[PDB]
Structure 1
Amino acid sequence: IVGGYTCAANSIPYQVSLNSGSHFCGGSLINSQWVVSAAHCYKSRIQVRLGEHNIDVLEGNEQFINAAKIITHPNFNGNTLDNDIMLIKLSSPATLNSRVATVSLPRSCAAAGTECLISGWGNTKSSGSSYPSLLQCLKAPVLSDSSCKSSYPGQITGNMICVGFLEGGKDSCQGDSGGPVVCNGQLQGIVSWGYGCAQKNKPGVYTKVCNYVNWIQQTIAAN
């Protein structure tokens, strides 16, 4: 996250870190057994780390739970990142408490200008790189489909939304992928891609979670 602030410890209790030797992507806890993330974060083996603030220190709220099943969207396009969503079933159910909680799936698609919270352990620098130990947070609005498409001519599918600031300076970046965009307590976005990060007229692009409630419920019922 560039241009954000350090979250209060455990104030984003649905945020997970996906770990394969180190942190490599975020995800969102949506059920005690299920995490949603980006299909471009796919690996064969993933340890889900819940209840984190400092990913470099055992602070005493962590739950480390290996993935039992990792299911990418059947229409995920690894080139364009269309349908950039996957579901991780945990090998044991996460215990839900104040520090580890589910986030709601969306009732409807978010209106343009809805304020959201974006979080992750991704790059905090627009010039160079720095990877935080502590979970970072960014308040940002949903952008109009028109503004999104004018920033990325011909690249925005019906499964993508833009969230952020056209002026630059405030965005998700490398290592935030798969993590949450939450607006009024509902998961509306998954960190997916952008042309670099925090550039002028290149807002973050996010998987449009309000297209996937059927697929998510289908996948949970089947597995």
Structure 2
Amino acid sequence: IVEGSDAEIGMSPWQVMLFRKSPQELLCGASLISDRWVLTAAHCLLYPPWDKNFTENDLLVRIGKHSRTRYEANIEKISMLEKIYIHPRYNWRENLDRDIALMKLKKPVAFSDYIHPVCLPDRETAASLLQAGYKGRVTGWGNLKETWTANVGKGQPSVLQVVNLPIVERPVCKDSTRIRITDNMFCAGYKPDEGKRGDACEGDSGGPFVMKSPFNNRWYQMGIVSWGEGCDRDGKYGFYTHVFRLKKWIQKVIDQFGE
């Protein structure tokens, strides 16, 4: 996350870290939507050009974490994955349309002050909050900057990072890139000279873009960190998987496969 700040304790209790088992490695962000289901980006699991291609036996997740580099005894939980599911129409060989995947935990994780599910949007929430200018929140342990110098690397924070960003008008998103944009994605970020900056970055893929409903006070996961061209460049924006638009598939998986 570029230009973000440290998360407060328990600020994003649905935050999940996706790791490759061996060699052990932090791969992507993800989110908890129930005691047995985790949401992430399809490209985190299946995407050859980025050394991504894994089944449930290649991965594990850590839930309830705040600091990347410290073992948080009696707070963090670890879990194997029973199975992974990728949207059947997920398109990697072009623009990553329907960049979404679900992962079922081998056992239910216990909720606590630090582990708690985020809500998925219904039509009314989507219709009322997905408006240009309305802000959402993106979180992750991804890189702090797109570039590196001889003395300063891209940077990997130890503490979870968070940034608030405004949803952008679709025509602006479209004109900012040559990559085709579908109705299964939306973009967010500040325009040049709105002053503020901020963006998700390498390593934040799969993490959530959440909005706090002023109607019932609950946090809803409106998007998934999907793609971008570099990080926090002027005139560029982050793209996110449109969760509500893929709700039918999400429901099918949970209903058809459990928990």
Pairwise same-fold verdict (TM > 0.5): yes
Listed as ranges, the gaps of 5+ residues in structure 1 are none
Q: TM-score normalised to the size of structure 1? A: 0.96
CA RMSD of aligned residues (A): 1.3
Alignment of structure 1 residues 92-111 onto 2, 5 Å: 92-108=107-123, 109=126, 110-111=130-131
Q: State the 1:122 CA deviation.
A: 0.3
- Aligned match for 1:191, one of 222, 225, 237: 225
In the alignment, structure 1 residue 139 sits paired with structure 2 residue 159 = no
Partner of 2:78: 64
Counterpart AA for 2:232? A
In structure 2, the residue matched to 1:178 is: 206
Contact 2:188-2:237 at 8 Å conserved across structures: yes
2:100 aligns with 85
- Structure 2 residue 192 is matched with structure 1 residue 162: no
> Contact between 2:184 and 2:246, CA under 8 Å: does it hold in 1?
no
Q: What is the distance in 2 between the residues matched to 1:218 and 1:174? A: 30
Structure 2: any 5+ residue segments left out of the alignment?
A: 46-53, 149-153, 213-218
For residues 100-151 of structure 1, give each alpha carbon's deviation from its aligned partner in whole angstroms, at most 9, with x where no partner exists. Answer: 0000001232222221110000000133211112100001111111221121
Q: How far did 1:10 drift?
A: 2.7
Can you list the C-alpha shifts for 1:53-83, whole angstroms capped at 9, x where unaligned?
A: 1122112210000111111110111122111
- 1:195 Cα deviation after fit: 1.0
Are 1:46 and 2:49 matched, yes or no?
A: no
Cα drift, residue 154 of structure 1: 5.3
- Secondary structure, aligned partner of 2:174: helix
CA distance, structure 2, for counterparts of residue 198 and residue 208 of structure 1? 20
Shift of 1:93: 0.6
Number of aligned positions between the proteins: 223
TM-score by length of 2: 0.83
Query: 1:10 touches 1:52 (CA, 8 Å); kept in 2?
Result: no
2:165 is paired with a residue whose SS is strand
Q: Matched residue of 2:18: which SS?
A: strand
1:164 CA displacement: 1.2
Q: Where does structure 1 differ by over 3 angstroms across 4 or more consecutive aligned residues?
A: none
Provide the rounded CA distance (Å) in 1 between the counterparts of 2:190 and 2:108: 37
Q: Equivalent residues in 2 for 1:123-138 (5 A)? A: 123-128=143-148, 129-138=154-163
Give the aligned partner of residue 152 of structure 1: 177
Higher mean C-alpha deviation, range 126-135 or range 12-21:
126-135
Q: One-letter code of the match for 1:37?
A: T
Cα distance per residue 1:18-60 (max 9 Å; x no partner): 0111211000101110000000000222111100011221122
Distance 1:154 1:58 in 2: 40
1:35 to 28, 34, 38: 38
